[PDB]
Symmetry: D2
Amino acid sequence: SLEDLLFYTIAEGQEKIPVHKFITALKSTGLRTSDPRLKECMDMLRLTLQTTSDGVMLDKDLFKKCVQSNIVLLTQAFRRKFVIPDFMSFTSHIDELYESAKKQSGGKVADYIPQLAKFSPDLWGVSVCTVDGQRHSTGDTKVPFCLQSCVKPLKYAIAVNDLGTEYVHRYVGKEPSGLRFNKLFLNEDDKPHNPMVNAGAIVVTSLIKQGVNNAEKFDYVMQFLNKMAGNEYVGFSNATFQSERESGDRNFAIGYYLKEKKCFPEGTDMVGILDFYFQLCSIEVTCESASVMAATLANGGFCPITGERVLSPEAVRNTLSLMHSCGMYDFSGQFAFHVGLPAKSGVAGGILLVVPNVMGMMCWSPPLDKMGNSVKGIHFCHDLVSLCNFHNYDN
Amino acid sequence: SLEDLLFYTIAEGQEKIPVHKFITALKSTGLRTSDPRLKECMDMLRLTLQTTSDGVMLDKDLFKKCVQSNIVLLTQAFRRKFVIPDFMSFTSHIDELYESAKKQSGGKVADYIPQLAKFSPDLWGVSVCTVDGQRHSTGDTKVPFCLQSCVKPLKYAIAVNDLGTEYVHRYVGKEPSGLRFNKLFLNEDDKPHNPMVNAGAIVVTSLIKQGVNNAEKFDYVMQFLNKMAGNEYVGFSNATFQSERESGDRNFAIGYYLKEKKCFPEGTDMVGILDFYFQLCSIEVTCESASVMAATLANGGFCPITGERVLSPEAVRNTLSLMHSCGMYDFSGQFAFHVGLPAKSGVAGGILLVVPNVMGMMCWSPPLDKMGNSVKGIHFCHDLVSLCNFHNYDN
Amino acid sequence: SLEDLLFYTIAEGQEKIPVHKFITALKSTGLRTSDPRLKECMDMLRLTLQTTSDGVMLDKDLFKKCVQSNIVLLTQAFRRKFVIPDFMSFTSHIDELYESAKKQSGGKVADYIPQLAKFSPDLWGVSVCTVDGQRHSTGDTKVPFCLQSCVKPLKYAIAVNDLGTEYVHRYVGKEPSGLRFNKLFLNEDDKPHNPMVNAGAIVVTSLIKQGVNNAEKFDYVMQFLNKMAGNEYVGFSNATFQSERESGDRNFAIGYYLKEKKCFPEGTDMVGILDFYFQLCSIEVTCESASVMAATLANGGFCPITGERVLSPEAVRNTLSLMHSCGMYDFSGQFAFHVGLPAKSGVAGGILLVVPNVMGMMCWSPPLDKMGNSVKGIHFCHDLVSLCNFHNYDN
Amino acid sequence: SLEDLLFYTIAEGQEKIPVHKFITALKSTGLRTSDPRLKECMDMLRLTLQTTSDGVMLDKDLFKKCVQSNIVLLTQAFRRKFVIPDFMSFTSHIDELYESAKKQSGGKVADYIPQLAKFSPDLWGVSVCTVDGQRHSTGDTKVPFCLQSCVKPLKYAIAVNDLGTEYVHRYVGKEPSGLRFNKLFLNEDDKPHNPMVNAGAIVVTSLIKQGVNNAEKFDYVMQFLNKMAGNEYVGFSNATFQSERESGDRNFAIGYYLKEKKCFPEGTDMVGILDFYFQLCSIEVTCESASVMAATLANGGFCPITGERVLSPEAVRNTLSLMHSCGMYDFSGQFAFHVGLPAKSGVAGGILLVVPNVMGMMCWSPPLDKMGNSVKGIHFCHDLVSLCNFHNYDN
């Protein structure tokens, strides 16, 4: 049977296979023992460990009993039918790129609020989540940090998922602005140029769950992020929020400018919307959870490690299309010339990368360049395409 | 004696001069019986009327007794040594220009707040106050209306009077912006282009009576306006204030923009300053009092009908210099090409005109042209220069 | 004819009656030449003065022509059929009481805001407006001052006039509280004890012109006050308003208390209502206009000097009933024991008195007693009843 | 040697002791393998497991090497010299009391905000942290929930720790109020009766880290809580915060009342302080971390599982003294009559208990009784004293 073939493949001309050998073989592919899809499996393994004092042998029966539950994924995992047959080489390349970027230093940790100018200019982490569940991480990849501007794609997606592309873009433009993210001007039809600049993001935040109050708005967005991350860490930084809602004079200017030109739906409280905008900017993540969010965007709108649909196909398509042409603001043209991938960056360090149909990725380093991007993150993104051929127009 | 010469001049080969004849002769020149400088005089006249049942004759003694108090002004008034020897012809020209402008119609009363779109498109008033006390008025020249933007010169003057030109312009520019009054941009050194656009006016309002609260600020400004108007009507429109503080999204945007670029003194509440700005815009006047304010600006900084110094010579000079090049915003170049006078206008109707060393003038008409100026006011200003040769560069 | 009888009554065995004699005879009764009901009359008199150089005689024709317009009031005025046949004696008593109260001194001008602690402790004015137009004033009776708490009756009346007693008292109680005006507690059914304490007044202010914004609310109330005052001075003190909205911590506490116990109609902004409450407290009056307002309350809800209905009979009845039992707060029982009249008082000085079916009265003196009432006002009210028998239960 | 004696005690007439036997023996006492004080120890054990494929024997050398680091605690733990020699019986009693309280049902989950009326009326957890590190938990003891009112003691302690008892009580009273927690009245010297009612808590929150902004205030308090909890879970509920800052009309009333009676230090923003108060109420904990906080209070102000001093002895003494007489508000007298322990309760469920010199405890159950306390929590507290003799006045 297929289970017998798998057992023989794991074994080497022997009779019994220990549990630890099976676990190591599973983890070598790239899957994590904590994968939700494997939950039942591991549970049974624990039930097997509850009997023996130390170590247990699975010859025919217990292995089949444990592997019987949802026997689809394991066959592909051990038949090397994923999107990256050898993840242990791509992980080595990720490590080499990480080391190469670590030598690069010299920047300026953001200091417009005290919660950003408290990270040492040495934290540096990279996390990759493949579209088929393979995950790898290297560096400070569990220190919480605020998404800041990395949430703006995640916002826009959600709106189009709940309302639709037609209705949503009845409010925001679709074309690169050509100027800085915080510039106070609108497109030809007095609309934000796109939902990636601050004006369009402020507009988009007002199309989400209209009518209900900010508690319900925040709860709805948090639930969406939780199942988009695959039930990974999504939190809130109240100290960052309290600093940000006090130093947001430019965003207040933008909000009033938008309110004067009638850029909001009917029946919208603009100052409350702006507070809700700061709150969504103050959501904490780790490289692990943000990599899973990017993988969700890259895959189909389905979660990679739960197989759950979170966004419409149209939402993901619209999200990647706008990220490619507006993700780095007036640097996107030059970021697309050398990387050619959908990407977003926040002033707290952090590059969110989508390799569509391959993976999502998060690269966090607090120190910034003059453009507002982490130096190591930009270096890593530049080198990854030159060493792995991910540019969209490569052959 | 000089009093005897004046009495003979008033009389025509007779013995006694009745009081009414003297009053008519005085009013023919242009002075008003309610002139503060003549106060004592009129009081004595009343003391003379308290005795006789009807009519009284002044031959030698009573005339000298009444005229003795402050006998300087009367000699100049009856010797035709004022700045306009015959005011009864300039008044006729003012009436002709008023009639000519009345025939002109077709505009749009301001309707962005309900307190402006309640004046019939037929109110039309003109008031002139000469630098030497002569006053004339024609039309609806006692209906209250908000100064709105006509206060911005009066603001700036006051600041330079209390602080100084150097300190004041350490905060605002000195050059025409080239764009609209409410555009959200600053000069080369991130400063308002001038104190006539909304940004520079918002900055100037924060240099006045710093430290104290808005009650004391408002009281100080009101006192300054009261002695600048010569103790004429200066009031407040609370309904207009309540409407304006609710529809001021553009000014809120400008204020937050200025707060982000550090365009205020140290220790300034910007939202409180903005409320104080709306309040100063909500001060009511009549053509009579605003004409006296303009006469004060035109004269020396001294009041015309009280002989009291209200502003420094530097304040008046700086005020007229900035009004000429910025009074009509991006229309000033064309307003200075055909009128060549310091002028200011508000969306509530109302043109404040200074003819330096000659007079001040107020022309109120609610209906506006597309530029934002009263049609009849602009017509009157254009025709006054073409019929009286007031252009600064005329010969 | 009746006109001939009046002419003979004015004359004393003569042929012609001069205009000044007629004016003096009219003013001796108590009516003012500026009475709106007499407007046309005076106009014709001016038309008569435009011809003769000085003085004019009315024998038969011109007198009839001038008196023909609205010949009802004059017959009653000269037949001594008013409510006070000899007003020249009640005026003498008012003057004696004024002089008696002036000798009394020693108090404490309110100093919780700077706009109240700026009046010298010597201003002292009294104004009386009879239900039939007779008016008398003595002292500083044209200096503006804020009504403050004297508006609370005027508020409540208006609500019941527009909504009805049943609906209005569905929200506020009807019984004396027994405690201070600013105590933070409610009646048995979690309602304000009455609309004279601050809680009930805050509730009443929210029943007026619901739905519209504060500009329209303020305009509506101002119009109501203007025709209630008979087109006398009703203004706004922006400096007092700005001080009062900053030192109103007790009223903010009361408003939040009321908001938590659900003491407002549905769809009410409590902080906006509180601002509107401060604004209505910041309306300026003079003894002249407030006396006319009190006369309107006393008469029928009709204006005394315009013959215009301003409030429903139910509104006036309910207003006087609540003023009698709650006008002085926990002093009313003792104020009704010695005066027995509807009265209200404000911390800016000012006693508003109603003698129902007789007159209205305003007595202004800034210095306060420990209870919060002007010393001279309380003295005048005590002495007026002891010298003129106005107590409601007198025989 | 002492290590040899310990090894013999662990062993039973054998040569070698396996690691798992030692771990089980250690955990039987009550200590947790994750104890920070044992950190180094466990690390070495891992270094021992890295060599052998499965299982390892420690005869003389490795046991001494692992136990050498900080060999003080183990001797007391295995000599039964802790404060509870047999924790496995107190844990059994805790389980019996938990089961007894679970059978009790019938209450009303708080529903004044939606974040409280979302917990099923079946969550029920109890956690005990002994003063010497022993810990036990039963039930849903890791579900986050807001402290709400359980933070008020933790607040007050901190203030007295940083400023001092004399200074702190210069602002708040020291005596039971006799009325409800949210009553709007003050003591004889216009001061909050104590820092356990809402007024005194609002005052106390304004004495903490004065001058700095709410970001720094929140960070300081969070750090204090983190080392008071022993580096256990301390978080924030932004949704609860956003709901609570919108439904806090009573607390706004109390704050304005306190601001009017001058109950704050000089230079305090009361609305900002109130927001900071809501934020501190919105801190999430679990029964595990709150039990450790209570143990810190009970012990000496030293942490139980880190041996670190967090508060002054005066702070802990003052905290327990005020909790005993004010912890349950106007129920304390009856709570002290049957329990006689320092305790605090919040409307989110949750009883914080201190058994001074013995332990701290947290008992969470959302459904409330009419008094505002969790039914199962009150039942557990009543039964614990009747079955274990913890009442302060027992013999």
